[PDB]
Copies of this chain bind each other. A is one copy, B any other.
Amino acid sequence: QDSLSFGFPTFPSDQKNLIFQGDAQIKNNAVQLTKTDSNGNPVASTVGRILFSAQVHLWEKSSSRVANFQSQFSFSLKSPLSNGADGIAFFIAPPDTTIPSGSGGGLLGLFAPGTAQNTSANQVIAVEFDTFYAQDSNTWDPNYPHIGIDVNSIRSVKTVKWDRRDGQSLNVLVTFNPSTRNLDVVATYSDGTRYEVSYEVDVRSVLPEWVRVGFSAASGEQYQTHTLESWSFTSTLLYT
């Protein structure tokens, strides 16, 4: 289909169109991407992702069209630790994408260690909300929590300083305009605090015509819950 749209105001346990990978699962009408014990407390060494089952037609060679899409979502992070890790990411990848081996911790369940910074060995666009930046293990990160736009590499092509707020929902709007090729990100907390970051990228030189969209999160030695609370998505093919 040229246009596809779906909305999850909440996430009831009875799901049919979501592909669950790793430790991801539904709990309390929300998606817990990373594993939690019986009490709902976060544990270390966990990775989880979800993908919408239907494939998205991102662009079309034959007609020279590229999709205009928008993804609105909200999540919250919780951790008794002063350094909760590792972060959550909204991503776009080939339909057959699976959790790479050894992609836990700072790799956010998105990249394999050997090629994490090799933009030539990956096909993925992601918006990360990174909370762990220890310069000795996450050598590619700026030295502070950040929102980053990732294009085939865990080393963000762009980051902006971000404030992690325990237990507070962050509302995010990610949009792509094929005319300008601008990928825009706008995130806000309930008190009006706002973050914005934009990047110009030709998606058809990075991703295949058909893709799947979803979220990924992970925790290595340090941990925190990565709770996806709501999500709506829409995409339509436009001439360019």
Residues of B within 8 A of A5 (CB): 3-6
The count of chain A contact residues (Cβ–Cβ below 8 Å) is 24
Q: A59 → chain B, closest Cβ, in Å?
A: 12
In this assembly, does A54 line the interface, its C-beta being within 8 Å of a C-beta of chain B? yes
Residues of B within 8 A of A210 (CB): 14, 16
- Chain B residue at smallest Cβ distance from A4: B6
Residues of B within 8 A of A232 (CB): 3
Q: A7 → chain B, closest Cβ, in Å?
A: 4
Residues of B within 8 A of A60 (CB): 12
Residues of B within 8 A of A17 (CB): 1, 54-55
In this assembly, does A97 line the interface, its C-beta being within 8 Å of a C-beta of chain B? no
In this assembly, does A180 line the interface, its C-beta being within 8 Å of a C-beta of chain B? no
A95 with B1: CB separation less than 8 A:
no
Q: A30 → chain B, closest Cβ, in Å?
A: 14
In this assembly, does A239 line the interface, its C-beta being within 8 Å of a C-beta of chain B? no
Bound form: Cα–Cα A57–B62 in Å: 33
A187-219 CB mask vs B (1 if < 8 Å, else 0) is: 000000000000000000000011000000000
Across the interface, A2 reaches (CB within 8 A) one of B1, B9, B52, B62, namely B9
Residues of B within 8 A of A95 (CB): 16
Residues of B within 8 A of A8 (CB): 1-2
Binding site for B on A (CB under 8 A): 1-9, 12, 14, 16-17, 52-55, 57, 60, 62, 95, 209-210, 232
Can you give 10 A-B contacts (C-beta < 8 A)?
A1-B6, A3-B5, A3-B232, A4-B5, A12-B60, A12-B62, A17-B55, A52-B54, A53-B53, A54-B54
Further 10 A-B residue pairs, CB within 8 A, beyond A1-B7, A4-B7, A52-B54:
A1-B8, A2-B9, A6-B54, A12-B60, A12-B62, A14-B210, A16-B95, A17-B54, A17-B55, A53-B54
